[PDB]
Each structure stands twice: as C-alpha cells, then as structure tokens.
Write a protein that binds this ligand. Structure first.
Ligand code: GTP
Ligand code: GDP
Ligand code: GDP
Ligand code: MG
Lengths: 48, 44, 442, 430, 430
C-alpha cells in the first residue's frame, strides 16, 4: 500500500508540471505572433 | 579593489539551466510530494 | 567513519552540485544547513558524519572542496542557492584556465594553486575520527582536470600514503567528442592514474545518453540528468557505510574483492531500475528481474560490451527490502547463463551486499520511486577495447606532431608522449596476459 | 579577465563605433554612461570591457587613432561619442597619403610613442589582462602601416598575452584605391609573423549577405558594420556570461591552430534571417547548423567547396540540450566526410552559453580554418606581381626610403604561406 | 513517411495550387496556416505533407519552378498563396521559348543547381523520406526540359526512394503548339528510363467529363484542375489515414508493374455526377464499380475495349463491407473474362480506407495498366516522323546545339516501347 501511494502522488505531480509548461509555451507563441504583427508597421515608413 | 559578489534572487537564478532545475526541486512541489522520502532504519 | 570529497574543474563541480543536492535530500538537511526539528524521532544516529561536520550551534557543513582554475563555475556556486551550506574557504578559484592543455595545468599554473589546496585538505583531515577515503570526480578530457588532478593525486599519495583514494572519472566517449585535443590529455591522465589510484570507475557520456534515450523517455537530455544518475550510483555505493543492513560492506572490502593484481583496478558500473513513473505501473520489480537487468549491455554506463571479454570479479549491491535467499537464487540463475563467462581461476565470482535503506527519490527527478534497486561494479577484460581506441587516435595525431608545439612550449619534454604511449601499450599487454589460461597437461 | 580594444583608421573607427553601440545596448548602459539595466547578469561582468568612473559612470576600454581628425570629429559627434575618455583620442596633423611607407616610417614613428603611452596606461590599470583586440583594413594607408607597427611593439612588450585582429581586405571585383596590392602584401607579411589569430572579411561577401539574405533595397556601411559588430560581440560572449560548457579565446586558439602559421580563419554567423520570413522556419539546432555551414553565410569570397576543413569551432548562445549539439556535430561530420581532414578524428569544437543576444531565441557563431583561403592570397599576388614587374607607382614608396628588397621578401613570404596551405589542401591522400 | 511535391511550369503550378487547396481543406488548415480542425484524426498524420514552423504554423513541402515569373506572381496572389514558403519559389529571367532544347540545355543547367539545393534541403530534413511526387506537362517548354532534367538528377542522388509522376500529354486534336511532337517524344524517352510509375492524362478526357458527365455549360481550367487534384489527393489517401486494409505507393507499384518498362497507367475517379442528376441516384458499391469501369470516366483518349488489362488497382475510401468489394471484383473478372490477361490469376488489388473525401459518403480511385496506352504514343510518333522527314523547324534545336542523332535515338526508343506493349498485348500461353 505504501509503494502504490507514493507512485500515485508522483504521477499527479508530473501532470501538474506538464500543464504549467504547456501554458508557458502558449503564452510565448502569442507574444511572438504579436511581435511579428508589430514589425509589419515598418512597411508604412517606407511608403511615407 | 575587487567588489564582493552580490547574491542572486529567485527569478535571477531561474534564468540559467542548472539553477532553474535546482529551484524546481526546491519550490515547485505539491503537498503530497514532500511525504515521499522517509526513514525505515531498524524497522525490518 | 568519514569521507572527504574533492571536486576539480567543471564536470567535477557540476557533478558535486548534483551529489550534494541528493545527499541533502536523503539526510533531510535544508539548503541553509539547518536540520529541522520535525524530522526527529527522539534519537538521531550520527549517520550524517560520513558527509557532514557539526560546529556546535547545530549548523551542518559538508566535507568537500570545489577546485577550479576559471572563476565562473565556483562563483556561481558561491552565489547560487546553496550559498550558506558551504564554507567560503572550501570554494577555491584561480585566475585563468588551463586552456585544454594538460601541460598548462601541470607545469605552469597548477603549481601555484596546489599548495592552497593541500592546506585545505589538511584542514579537513585533522578534524575527523578516522578518514576512510577520498572521493574524486573529474574528466580526463580537459586541461585542468588532467593536469591538476594528476599533480594533486601525486601530492596526496606522498603525504597521506596508504590511505585510500577512489576516483569517479568521465572518459572521452568513443565517437561523441567535445574538443580536438582530448586524446593527448586522456593518455597522459591514464598514465598518472595507473600509479596513484586504488579503484577507478570508468564512465562514457555516450552510454548515459543512450540509456536515457532508450530506458527513460527523454528526448533532449542535458548534463544535469547524467549527473543525477552518477549521484545515485555514488549514493548506492556509500549507503553501505551509513545505514543498517544484513550484509555490510566497508570500502576496504571493495578493494580486497575486486582487485586481483595491483594494476587491474578499472571497473565497469551499471544500475538496474532506471524506470519512469508511468512505466513503473506496468512491471513488477523483483530481485531476479533487476539482477538479470544489470548484466545486459543496454544497462551499462560505459561504452564497452562485456560479452567480448571475461569477468574476473563481480560486486553486487542490493539496497532496500530484499532477502538473501532471493539474492542467492538470482546469482545462481546468472551463473547458469551461457553468454556470461568467468575466468577459470575465479570460481566464486560474486560478492553480495544487502542494505535496508531504499533509494531516495528527488522531487524534480525522472526516476520512479521503487522499493528496491541493485548496483554493480565489475572487473572485465572488455576494458582493453577502450584503450585501443584511444591509442589509435593518439597515434594518428602524434605521427605528424599535429598540436605538440603548445605542449612543448608549456614546459614539457617531447619524450613524455612516447613514455605514456608505451605505458598504455604495457597495460594492454597486461590485460592480454591475465586472461590467458594456464595449461599443465602431460 | 578584461579586453582592451584598439581602433585604427576610418574603417576601424566606424566599426568600433558600431561595436560600442552594440555592447552598450547589451549591458544596458545609457549614452550618458549611467547604468540603467534590468538584471544582475548585465552588471556582474561589466568590468570585462568597462572601467568604472566615479558616481555611476562607466568608460569603454578603447584607444582611437587616426592621421586626419575628420573621422575622429565625426565619431565625437555621434550618438555615443561622448562616452569615450578624451585622453584616449590620438590623432596627427597630416594624412597617410594612402602610402604604407609613410604610415609605417614617417608619420608612424611620429605618433607611435603617444599610442604606446596610452595603451600602457590602459593595460596597467587592469587587475589581470587578457588579449588586445584591433580592428583595421589592410587596403588603406594608416590602418595597415601604423596598425602593424603598433602590433609589433605590443608583441614585443606583451608576448604572453593574446593578440587578436579583425581585418577587412580589398576585393578584386571592386577597388576603392589603385595601390591596394602593395599595402595588402606588406600587411600580410607583418601579420603572419606578429599575429596569434586573424580573421579576414571581404566587403563583397557582406554585400552578397545583405542582398540575398536580408534583401535590403539600399544597404549602407552601417549595415556592414552591424554584421561585423555582431560577430565581434559574439566571439567574446562566453567570457561574460555563465554557461554549461565555458570557452575562452585562448581555448579557441589552442583548438583551432595546428601549426603557428595557419592562424587565418573564415567567419560566419548563422541565424541571420528577416523577422518576417522567420515565421516560416522555426529555430532548432539542426536549422542553425545547416545555415551555419551554408556558403551563403560565409564572410569571405573563397568558397569552402574548393577546399577542406582542417578545424572548426561553434559557440552556441541560448537554452538548449547538449545531446542535440553533440549529435548534430556527429551527423554533419559523418555525412559530409570528404570535406574534413582525415588525420584528425573530430574537427569541430562546440561550446554552449546560456544568455542569447536580446530578441533572438538562439544564435551560433562559426569560425572555420579552411585551405580555400589560399585563394585570397593568390589573387593579390598576381595583381602585385603584375604591378611590380613594371615598377608601378613605386617611386612614392622608395622616396620614403624603402629598399626594393622588402617587396621581394614580402612577396616570397606570402608565396610560402600559399604553398603551405596548398600542400595541406591536396585532396588526394596519396 | 512524408512526400515532397514538385510542381513545374504553368500547368504544374496551377495544378499544385488546386491540390494544396484541397489537401489544406481536408486537414483543416486556415489560409494563414493555423490548424483549426476538430478531430485528432486530422492532426495525427499532418506531418506527411507539412513541416512545422515556429509558433503553430505549418508549411507545405513543395517546390515551385518556372522560367518567367508571371504565373508565379499569380499563384502567390491567390487565396492560399501566402501559406507557401517564399524561398521555395524558383524563377529565372528569360523564358523557355516553348522550346525543349533551351529548357534542357541552356536555362536548365543555369537554374538546376538552385533547384537541387532546395530539394536536398527539403529532403534531408525528413526523419524518414517516402518517394517524391512530380506534376508537369510534356507539351510545354520548361516543364518538359527542366522537369526531366530534375528527375534525372534526383534519380542519380536518391536511387532507393520512389519517383512518381502525373503528366499531361498533348491532345492529337486540341493542340496549342505546332512543335508538340518533339517535346513529347524527348520527354517520354526521358521518363521511361527515369520514372518508377507514370500516370497520363488527356485534356480531351477532362473536357468530355465536364461536358458529358457534369453537363457544365461553360467549363474553365479550374474544373479540369479540380478533377486532377481529386485523383492526385486520392492515390495517397491510404498513406495518411487508418483503414481495414492499408496500402502504400510502393505496394501499388509492386502489384501493378510486371516488368520495369511497363509503368504507364490510366486513371479514373467514380462518384462524378451532375447536380441535377445527383438527386436521382444513391451511392452504393455496385454503382461505384460500374462507374469505375465505364470508359466515359477514364482520363485518357485510348479506350480499354481496344486493349487488355495486365493489372488493375482499386483504392476505396469509406466505411464499407469487405464482402461486397471481394464479390464485386470476382463478378467483374468472371463476366468480362476476355478483357483480362489470362496468365495472371487475379489482376485487381483492393484497399479500404475509413475516411472519405469531404462531402462524399464513399469514393474509389482507379489505376490501370492497359496496353491501349500504346495508341497514344503511336499517334504522336506518326506526326513526329512527318515533321522530321522534312526537317521541320529543325534549325532552332540544332542552333541550340543538339546532334541530329538524338532525334533518331529518341524515335527508336519510343518505337521499341510501343513494340514491347504490343507484344505483351498479343502474348499467349502456348
Ligand atoms: N557528465 C558530464 N560531463 C561533462 C560535463 N561538463 C563537461 N563534461 C565533459 O568533460 C569533458 C570536458 O572537460 P571540462 O570539465 O570542461 O574541462 P575543465 O575541467 O573545465 O578544464 P578547462 O577547460 O581547462 O577549464 C568533455 O568530455 C565533456 O563532455 C558535465 O557537466 N557532466
Ligand atoms: N566595412 C567597412 N569598410 C570600410 C568603411 N570605410 C572604409 N572602408 C573600406 O576600407 C578601405 C579604405 O580604407 P581606409 O579606412 O580609408 O584606409 P585609411 O585611409 O588608412 O583610413 C576600402 O576598401 C573601403 O571600402 C566602413 O565604414 N566599413
Ligand atoms: N489540364 C491542364 N492543362 C494545362 C493547364 N495549363 C496549361 N495547360 C496546357 O499545357 C500546355 C501549355 O504548357 P505550359 O504549362 O504553358 O508550358 P510552360 O510554358 O513551360 O509552363 C498546353 O497544352 C495547355 O493547354 C492546366 O491548368 N490544366
Ligand atoms: Mg574548462
């Protein structure tokens, strides 16, 4: 019983860190998309 | 003269690779994971 | 019962960080060195003493030095998370690196740093009841690890004499490589290591990468994973000193059982239940399956195949809830196998140990939690293949003196290359001769 | 472990201005000199390139030398120009005249003592001195002559330190000055004796980088000097930030140079790609290595496909696995095995650093020692021998005082350098 | 197991545009490139055709080549054009001139190195590479000459992979160009050596499909390219989705080609039916098999009733019974037994895939190896011989550099291909 309890706890913790990492990656991708959209505005400088 | 080295904070250590996964052991845990290690000396 | 740890250079300090992380979490010492009051059970046996000393205010401090020629890694340790654990005097740093030159470490620069190191080692050794060895972590591929490791082992061997010195050594992998000049430094290192070490454990990073890809499910491992595996191995070997057990094994028992002749002291190491938590629920982990596991070459932490050689002695360490009858049944099953061969002069090929303390689980770690594990170090003729491969690359470069002018400018006679190459040739012949059967038939 | 920079001539002063802009940006130093950064990692190695002046200020360890003050007044007028210490500016009163002999013998000896006094003042202030860094062109006049003069004196005075030079060399396709072959030949003669490691860049390669890779419609010398400032700041990155596998200028030299004359290297920097196109290809260690070895990304006219790699070095910046680096270097060495010199079992050194340049997830810098460099010297030699047989424009140099024997000596020494590279190229093992 | 596509010339770029629209729709890729699908079954094989670029995006593994950029600018301007990686567009500065010799020898060798560099960069990125797929017309100029050049180079560099072609061949009646016979003859000569499997389509058959089957009043090239994109996406469908009886391009080739020269196939696709008629007839396996063998639905001018089937293959998409498939193939083989070659006991391979094309309950694609394909080559060869006896237009080709002997070799090789097909048509057990 002791060993099965320990293993279950470890699996749950692994799931928690996996979810947190995925959230961080999603935030990073959104920031990258915004920054790419920002640099498009340099096309107006050439026009003017 | 050599100025003494200033200690780092929590977020500064997290920047590198070694320190980030040291702090992962130190801080990022659930309540159940701190129970994992125990002493079984003289029990069997 | 005490041991002193000496960490030299970059690999040795980073492996020290992983080791002391593990030893703290296993004993229960907080990062500030203060043992907490809730970890008490009424009495507190002095198990820490192998690795810690007390001041008297109850802070713990560890019996280790960190040695480097460049500041960056040691000031990172001084400024890191464990700042309050180490005494600042223990963290010794020079001004400038040995620039991948063994000659630069040994002749020009290490003679300046070596006397401070010896004074610190003296300061550790006077404050113990009885020192029973040194643990040394280094890589033979780099300049300061080779040159200062050799110089320091020579001085230690003269000053302390008969006292044992046990080395954990990262050897250059057979096709993964990090620097061009690795063969010269590794040959000269092995030359120094032959005279001045009692047991030498050989490691290859390519094997630990293969093991972490195949057994664990890690796509992108980094040095912290390898260092955690090494720390687990060292903790398993030193657990026999620190906790109660059925069959204890003192560090002198290792030397008596594993070494048949005084030069034949290089051993292979492997560890059985490297397993993931998700993997952990698919398998039972009885004594006989992990005993069968430690003999497969997919389990080894050095890139050599023992099926191409003969075993001389095996030392098997079991830790946790295991019973001797199961160990005996397992060893008899191993002995039955036809692809496992022992030299005919070594009939009783095995030494066993059984300890009650199960392996510790590290919060961020990648190994599962398991009730039992076995760890093996074994002496086998297969090791002759690693030297032959180092020697061919040395011969290739040295035939045209490809880089020698750096080494010759830094204080070295050209003759030293040929001497070392002949000593490694003689070591190869020793491993050829020991494995030869003696026949006395009319 | 502090570096001292020297910038000589117009090209050197302009490249230096862009370099000190890039470094001041990387360490968060305001153009007034006040520290305004946002992480301790910026502060903890600032000493490497800056000295600390009182109440806040930082000063950059650089000496500026030129023969006519027009450029120096332009640099003082620039946006960061105020940061430089006034006593560090050395200038004369009459030009080099595009003449190596004037720059070396007549105005050189006139100014040179004040430069040595300033460099010694800067050197003796360091607690431990690492090598010097010099930027100059080989085709010019004061850059070539006085730069090599100063290099010879510093090699006499500091033989145990490192001497590192970055040098721009005249393109055969487009000269700006007629007498380029003489100045180049004499400068290479000085460098092969004096230098420890020298990197060479062709302006033609920077133009092709800009037009093909960056697709700039109207490039300017500011862009070329930005590429140079990027590589210059990249070579030193392991000096000033933590990492999993530290590296050093001396460690690079020890691993790259097999024999002491073979110290001329090609340079490249891989993740150059416009931010708009970057969305079409993600960063990864294989991607960086493939761009890194692509001849489109190499800063010299010679192409690697006509030679063989003796050695290579890779410095990685960013958070990445060591396994991926090692296995990439193994796969590239195994798959392209004919281009690697066979009596060395592994030609590539790797290094990994934690802190990338701002706004890039990952970067690598590549240094390659390749025999195809024999091409640059051979092309210059033909143009020189063409000029020398007819005693072309020679009276200017001889009137300063040169013996004709120097030109034949310099030609012979360069020809022997070409021969030594050519023997090791021989693709056939024979 | 990933496929790399190559689209060459105007026909190739247009077919590619419609193909990548259909595939991107089937896998739920937005015209910005973002995945927006609604089942994991869509995601789990996306790797087969797309590479993943950073922050979400996918890019399609295709190379676009043409000699004048007008078409390329038109495809970039189309509704999905933005998805394509800019660096994958290769174009020259002067046209093919509708001349095969120019496309093969003069501008071909000028561009081919940059195309091979792009194809290798794309191929070497795959973790395991399946065959290449190429679409082009034989009647054009750059399509025929540079396409066959590239096929020959890729067959030299990757001889163990698969080479697959879809090819448009000049109508005997609807010609757009006078010199079509030369371009066709030289291209078929190149294909029979280089290709592993080649499919041939007549534009007349697409017109007859549109007018007779779909009853369109005013068809356009978009409809013809939609029919082609439907069959093209159907042959590979079993590669990229689960099924009860999986199939693969290699399994089709191994089962269809008895001897290595006999690799030219006819194509058809069954559930074609006009919007007015569609209310009148439900889908069922008998209906698909009957439409599948009707010569009205076959994409070549030759009719099977004039030849014999060596082998055939059927790929089924949808949730359907295996019993009905097996019993239909037995019943069709038994009832029409005179049209099947008797020394093979069973000529048809079947395959079943669970996931149909969007908006259809069921579909089948047919690949057929029939000797009536010999009729196309013979008709093209007569007109070539008519032109060559009078040396028609020959000065263009000879001025480019061709020896007249190439024309006699190409004619002889094509005539031998026709003879070999005719011999297998009339073979007997004896
Ligand atoms: N397992 C492991 N091996 C390492 C680590 N760091 C370096 N190595 C290996 O050790 C060899 C390099 O030795 P280094 O420790 O970098 O040499 P050094 O002690 O720093 O000597 P210097 O460069 O002169 O300062 C190579 O084979 C590396 O693969 C590490 O953190 N863990
Ligand atoms: N990359 C770069 N090259 C330059 C710059 N200014 C001049 N050059 C080149 O250097 C050479 C001229 O040398 P110059 O600096 O005028 O020699 P000086 O008169 O002795 O200072 C020519 O090849 C120029 O193209 C610059 O700002 N950047
Ligand atoms: N079926 C079909 N045929 C086409 C298409 N575009 C052009 N063609 C035919 O291909 C031939 C012209 O070849 P073309 O592609 O212009 O050659 P290129 O100039 O080298 O690209 C003519 O027979 C056209 O009818 C198309 O989208 N579909
Ligand atoms: Mg080091």
């Amino acid at each position: 019983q002791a060993v099965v309890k320990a293993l279950a706890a470890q699996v749950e913790g692994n799931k928690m860190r996996a979810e947190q990492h995925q959230l961080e990656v999603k935030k990073e991708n959104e920031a990258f998309c915004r920054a790419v959209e920002e640099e498009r505005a340099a096309e107006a400088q050439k026009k003017m | 003269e050599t100025k003494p080295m200033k200690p780092k904070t929590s977020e500064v250590i997290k920047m590198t690779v070694e320190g980030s996964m040291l702090q992962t052991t130190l801080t990022q845990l659930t309540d159940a994971e701190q129970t994992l290690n125990t002493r079984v000396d003289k029990k069997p | 019962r005490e041991a002193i740890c000496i960490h030299i250079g970059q690999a040795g300090c980073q492996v020290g960080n992983a080791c002391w992380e593990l030893f703290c979490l296993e004993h229960g010492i907080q990062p500030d060195g203060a043992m907490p009051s809730d970890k008490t059970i009424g009495v507190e046996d002095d198990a820490f003493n192998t690795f810690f000393s007390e001041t008297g205010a109850g802070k713990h401090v560890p019996r280790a030095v960190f040695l480097d020629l460049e500041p960056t890694v040691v000031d990172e340790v001084r400024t890191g998370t464990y700042r309050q654990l180490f005494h600042p005097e223990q963290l010794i740093s020079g001004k400038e690196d040995a620039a991948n030159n063994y000659a630069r470490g040994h002749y020009t620069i290490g003679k300046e740093i070596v006397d401070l190191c010896l004074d610190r080692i003296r300061k550790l050794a006077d404050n113990c009841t009885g020192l029973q060895g040194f643990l040394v972590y280094h890589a033979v591929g780099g300049g300061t690890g080779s040159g200062l490791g050799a110089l320091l082992l020579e001085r230690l061997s003269v000053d302390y004499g008969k006292k044992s010195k046990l080395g954990y050594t990262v050897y250059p992998s057979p096709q993964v490589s990090t620097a061009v000049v690795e063969p010269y430094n590794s040959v000269l290192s092995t030359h120094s290591l032959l005279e001045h070490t009692d047991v030498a454990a050989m490691l290859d990073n390519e094997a630990i990468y293969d093991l972490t890809r195949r057994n664990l499910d890690i796509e992108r491992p980094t040095y912290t994973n390898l260092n955690r595996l090494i720390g687990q191995v060292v903790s398993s070997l030193t657990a026999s000193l620190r906790f109660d057990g059925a069959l204890n094994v003192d560090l002198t028992e290792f030397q008596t059982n594993l070494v048949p002749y005084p030069r034949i002291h290089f051993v292979l190491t492997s560890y059985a239940p490297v397993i993931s938590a998700e993997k952990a629920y698919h398998e039972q982990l009885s004594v006989s399956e992990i005993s069968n596991a430690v003999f497969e070459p997919a389990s080894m932490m050095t890139k050599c195949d023992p099926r191409h050689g003969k075993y001389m002695a095996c030392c098997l360490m079991y830790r946790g809830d295991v019973v001797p009858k199961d160990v005996n049944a397992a060893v008899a099953t191993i002995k039955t196998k036809r692809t496992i061969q022992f030299v005919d002069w070594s009939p009783t090929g095995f030494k066993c140990g059984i300890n009650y303390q199960p392996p510790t689980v590290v919060p961020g770690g990648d190994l599962a939690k398991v009730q039992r594990a076995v760890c093996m170090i074994a002496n086998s003729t297969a090791i002759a293949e690693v030297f032959a491969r180092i020697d061919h690359k040395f011969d290739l470069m040295y035939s045209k003196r490809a880089f020698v002018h750096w080494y010759v400018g830094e204080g070295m006679e050209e003759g030293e290359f040929s001497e070392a190459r002949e000593d490694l040739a003689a070591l190869e012949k020793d491993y050829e001769e020991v494995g030869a059967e003696s026949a006395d038939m009319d | 472990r502090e570096i001292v920079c020297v910038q000589a001539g117009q090209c050197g002063n302009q490249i230096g201005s862009k370099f000190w802009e890039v470094i001041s940006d990387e360490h968060g130093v305001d153009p007034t000199g006040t520290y305004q950064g946002d992480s301790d990692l910026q502060l903890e190695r600032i000493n490497v390139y800056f000295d600390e002046a009182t109440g806040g200020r930082y000063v950059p360890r650089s000496v500026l030398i030129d023969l006519e003050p027009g450029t120096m007044d332009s640099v003082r007028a620039g946006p960061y120009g105020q940061i430089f210490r006034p006593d560090n500016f050395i200038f004369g009163q009459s030009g080099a005249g595009n003449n190596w002999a004037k720059g070396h013998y007549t105005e050189g000896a006139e100014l040179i003592d004040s430069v040595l006094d300033v460099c010694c003042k800067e050197a003796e202030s360091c607690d431990c001195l690492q090598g010097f860094q010099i930027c100059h062109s080989l085709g010019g006049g004061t850059g070539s002559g006085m730069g090599t003069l100063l290099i010879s004196k510093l090699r006499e005075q500091y033989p145990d330190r490192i001497m590192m030079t970055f040098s721009i060399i005249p393109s055969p396709k487009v000269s700006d000055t007629v007498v380029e072959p003489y100045n180049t030949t004499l400068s290479v003669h000085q460098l092969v004796e004096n230098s420890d490691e020298s990197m060479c860049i062709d302006n033609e390669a920077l133009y092709d980088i800009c037009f093909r890779t960056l697709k700039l419609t109207t490039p300017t010398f500011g862009d070329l000097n930005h590429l140079v400032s990027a590589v210059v700041s990249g070579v030193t990155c392991c000096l000033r930030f933590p990492g999993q596998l530290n590296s050093d200028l001396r460690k690079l030299a020890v691993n790259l140079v097999p024999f002491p004359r073979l110290h001329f290297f090609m340079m490249g920097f891989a993740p150059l790609t416009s931010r708009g196109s970057q969305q079409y290809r993600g960063l990864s260690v294989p991607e960086l290595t493939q761009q890194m070895f692509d001849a489109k990304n190499m800063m010299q006219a010679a192409d690697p496909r006509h030679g063989r790699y003796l050695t290579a070095s890779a410095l990685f910046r960013g958070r990445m696995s060591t396994k991926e680096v090692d296995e990439q270097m193994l796969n590239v060495q195994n798959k392209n095995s004919s281009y690697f010199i066979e009596w060395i079992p592994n030609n590539i050194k790797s290094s990994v650093c934690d802190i990338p340049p701002k706004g890039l997830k990952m970067a690598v810098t590549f240094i390659g020692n390749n025999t195809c460099i024999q091409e640059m010297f051979r092309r210059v030699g033909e143009q020189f021998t063409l000029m020398f047989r007819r005693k072309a424009f020679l009276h200017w140099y001889t009137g300063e005082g040169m013996d004709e024997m120097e030109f034949t000596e310099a030609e012979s020494n360069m020809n022997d350098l070409v021969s030594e590279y050519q023997q090791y190229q021989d693709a056939t093992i024979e």
